[PDB]
Design a protein around this ligand. Structure first.
Ligand code: ZN
Lengths: 51, 70, 197, 277, 68, 47
């Protein structure tokens, strides 16, 4: 890993009991907010709306 | 020798496992979990856990010491 | 070989600079031994004295054996040359290096090696002399040498027993001596040292 | 005269079984015991047997040695016919990996002062789960040599290494203060046979017949699951061909189990019906 | 050997050297496995006389390595 | 050793190989012409 890769505010994995940074995990996204994102678009369409 | 390997897999997939929440799929056969103990770990997914069925924020069972998403 | 001694020294120097561990140190020692084997030129060893001095314990044995391999095929100045080059590890390594210098073609120095192995006090010197005698008598199947090596094997000490067994094999090479097979197999089945095994 | 990285501790099957039994017979306590054996020449620690120690209350330390107990049992076993010195000591670290704490280092230092070739053995009953026996053997390093810089343990052979030291031990000083030792097991053929006798199947078990009702029920369960897997397999293969696996693998597993179970039971039935008359 | 006979010193040296996994000092045995790749001309007196051989190839395929 | 199948001497000088330069090793080069027959010096064995 590189310091320019571990620029601040990025989740990183640490080896147990030694705490040796060894990966760049994807940026933190809170659970119960990650699922607040439409992954399967509903089936409604503007053609289903009248007036 | 390939036998005893399925056996060791089914044995590491033991009874006293600890429940946790699978937060995100970092990469193939590895992911971030949060153990109900209250701490988050970056653990390794076992094979054959239906990555399709392994959706975000799902309920998983982890090895009691390796914390692997068994 | 001495005429066409077109070796390379600065590659070895680069490895030496890169060494940090004792394993890598002895590795460079043996690599230099190989590179100068049959060349009789010990420039690198005679230059990097402090490097050799860093060698400790069996590393000294290996370094002296490396000197022997470098002087492989050089039988005119033997005995006196090894005396000039000069602990128990040093003496054992010197005997082993002399044996290596006197390769399969042994002959005259067989009696020498036999006498020193007989009147060798320390087990390390015994091990080195046994390996050297095995080298010298390899294929000769001399009964006196075999008997002395069997006596040196009939103890309980890994360092002596390993060399004793290897030398017994070298001396009895190919002879298929049924007595030797019986003796060695029995001692293997009865002993209690994995290294002797 | 420096110990080389070829010394190896040959733990007997009896010693290992006793150690692990005691660990699980007193978890979560730090159980302790001596190790009766015989150093062979310089590179072997042949641990013939181990030595349970009464729970001394004060955890694990030199204060728990109980010299009177140690000596009296030493003499008494010698009378029984077990004349070996006290080669090292074993003590468990339940759950907390394998390594030495401060008190462990102190006790090992006392043992080395008594005889500077003993060992400290660590066994973890909780993490020695089925199929994994996490045991370790350790000996201390000398501050004078460490400061001098000479490596704590000579390396004359490719043995001794070949093992990945645990990061737990690295943190707890796997090399700063002490060093690990390779563990070999002296599995005699007779002991191996007597262990096999544990799960060795009796001829009754070999020649018996599985219950026919349960057999038919299991056959139906597996056949119906195989039917569903066949439907899925067709769907997968048809879509693959049109566009241009797990169903196939599961189908293979199910067919294999069906074939083996059915053939086994049929052959056993014939063996029985024309052996018992 | 150059004629076809198995070279007993060479095989012995190779085997013992391969048996270094258990003992480093044996590593020197491989020394016995080196055969000088020399074609040496000698005459009646057995004193190596000054002679010149000729080889038909480029001076690159069998030359010493670059000094680096 | 690969460079032995192709190896000879120039214009068949005073020295002629006993056996062709393919076996290699040591060859007793037979001599035809009589001359000074200069030898090769025994270089010292130190490097
Ligand atoms: Zn402890």
């Amino acid at each position: 890993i590189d310091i320019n890769d571990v620029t601040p505010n990025c989740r990183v994995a640490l080896r147990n009991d030694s705490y040796t940074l060894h990966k760049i995990l994807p940026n933190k996204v809170d659970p119960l907010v990650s699922l607040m994102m439409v992954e399967k678009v509903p089936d409604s369409t503007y053609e289903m709306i009248g007036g | 020798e390939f036998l005893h390997a399925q056996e060791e897999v089914k044995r590491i997939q033991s009874i006293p496992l600890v429940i946790g929440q699978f937060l995100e799929a970092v990469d193939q056969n590895t992911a971030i979990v949060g153990s109900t103990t209250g701490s988050n770990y970056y653990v390794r997914i076992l094979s054959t856990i239906d990555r399709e069925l392994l959706k975000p924020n799902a309920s998983v069972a982890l090895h009691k010491h390796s914390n692997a998403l068994v | 070989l001495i005429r066409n001694n077109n070796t390379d020294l600065m590659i070895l120097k680069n490895t030496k600079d890169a060494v940090r561990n004792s394993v890598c140190h002895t590795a460079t020692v043996i690599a230099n031994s190989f590179m100068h084997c049959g060349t009789t030129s010990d420039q690198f060893l005679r230059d990097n004295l402090e490097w050799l001095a860093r060698a400790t314990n069996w590393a000294k044995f290996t370094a002296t054996a490396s000197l022997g391999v470098i002087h492989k095929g050089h039988e005119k100045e033997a005995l006196q040359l090894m005396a000039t080059y000069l602990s128990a590890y040093q003496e054992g390594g010197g005997l082993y290096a002399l044996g290596l210098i006197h390769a399969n073609h042994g002959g005259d120095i067989i009696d020498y090696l036999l006498n020193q192995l007989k009147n060798a006090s320390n087990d390390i010197v015994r091990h080195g002399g046994s390996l050297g005698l095995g080298l010298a008598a390899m294929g000769t199947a001399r009964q006196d040498v075999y008997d002395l090596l069997k006596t040196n094997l009939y103890q309980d000490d890994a360092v002596t027993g390993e060399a004793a067994g290897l030398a017994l094999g070298l001396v009895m090479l190919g002879s298929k001596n049924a007595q030797a097979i019986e003796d060695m197999v029995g001692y293997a089945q009865e002993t209690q040292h994995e290294k002797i095994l | 005269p420096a110990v080389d990285t070829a010394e190896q501790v040959y733990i007997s099957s009896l010693a290992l079984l006793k150690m692990l039994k005691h660990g699980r017979a007193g978890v979560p306590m730090e159980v302790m015991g001596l190790m009766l054996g015989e150093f062979v020449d310089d590179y072997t620690v042949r641990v013939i047997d181990v030595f349970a120690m009464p729970q001394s209350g004060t955890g694990v330390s030199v204060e728990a040695v109980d010299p009177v107990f140690q000596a009296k049992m030493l003499d008494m076993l010698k009378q029984t016919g077990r004349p070996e010195m006290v080669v090292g000591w074993y003590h468990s670290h339940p759950g907390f990996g394998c390594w030495l704490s401060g008190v462990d280092i102190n006790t090992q230092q006392s043992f080395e002062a008594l005889s500077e070739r003993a060992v400290a053995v660590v066994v973890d009953p909780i993490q020695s789960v089925k199929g994994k026996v996490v045991i370790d053997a350790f000996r201390l390093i000398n501050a004078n040599m460490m400061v001098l810089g000479h490596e704590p343990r000579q390396t004359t052979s490719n043995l001794g290494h070949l093992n990945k030291p645990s990061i737990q031990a690295l943190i707890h000083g796997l090399n700063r203060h002490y060093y690990s030792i390779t563990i070999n097991y002296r599995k005699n053929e007779l002991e191996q046979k007597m262990l096999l006798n544990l799960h060795k199947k009796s001829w009754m078990e070999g020649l018996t017949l599985q219950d026919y009702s349960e057999h038919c029920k299991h056959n139906e369960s597996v056949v119906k699951e195989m039917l569903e897997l066949a439907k899925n397999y067709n769907k997968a293969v048809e879509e693959e061909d049109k566009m241009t696996q797990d169903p196939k693998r599961h189908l293979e597993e199910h067919v294999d189990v069906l074939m083996t179970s059915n053939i086994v039971q049929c052959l056993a039935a014939m063996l029985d019906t024309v052996v018992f008359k | 050997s150059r004629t076809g006979h198995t070279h007993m010193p060479s095989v012995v040296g190779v085997l013992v050297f391969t048996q270094f996994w258990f003992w480093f000092p044996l590593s020197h045995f491989l020394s016995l496995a080196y055969t000088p790749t020399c074609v040496i001309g000698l005459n009646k007196d057995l004193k190596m006389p000054k002679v010149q051989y000729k080889s038909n190839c480029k001076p690159s395929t069998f030359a010493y390595p670059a000094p680096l | 050793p690969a460079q032995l199948k192709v190896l000879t001497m120039p214009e068949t000088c005073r020295y002629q190989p006993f056996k062709p330069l393919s076996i290699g090793g040591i060859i007793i080069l037979k001599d035809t012409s009589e001359d000074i027959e200069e030898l090769v010096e025994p270089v010292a064995a130190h490097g």
